[PDB]
């Protein structure tokens, strides 16, 4: 770290045997969904006789 370097956008101190070339970003979100619902019903009889 003799002639102690620093990255161009100075926010680090690289050692003087390395050089940097700055770039990036990347991300990706994704999601899914699934629902359901069911029902039913009834029946009836009746007879009143005589």
């Amino acid at each position: 770290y003799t002639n102690c370097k620093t990255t161009e956008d100075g926010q680090y101190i690289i050692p003087d045997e390395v050089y940097t070339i700055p770039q990036k970003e990347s991300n990706l979100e994704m999601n899914s969904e699934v629902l359901e619902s069911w029902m039913n019903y009834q029946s009836t009889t009746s007879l009143s006789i005589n």
Partner: protein, 38 residues
Amino acid sequence: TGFQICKNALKLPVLEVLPGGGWDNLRNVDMGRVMDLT
């Protein structure tokens, strides 16, 4: 070749992208200094 002297004198940040640097056209990625930058 230490820009820190005048980056210290005047408080501006050094540009990051610089042309004087070799470049592999096959792998397609920067390689190293060629033209010196004082």
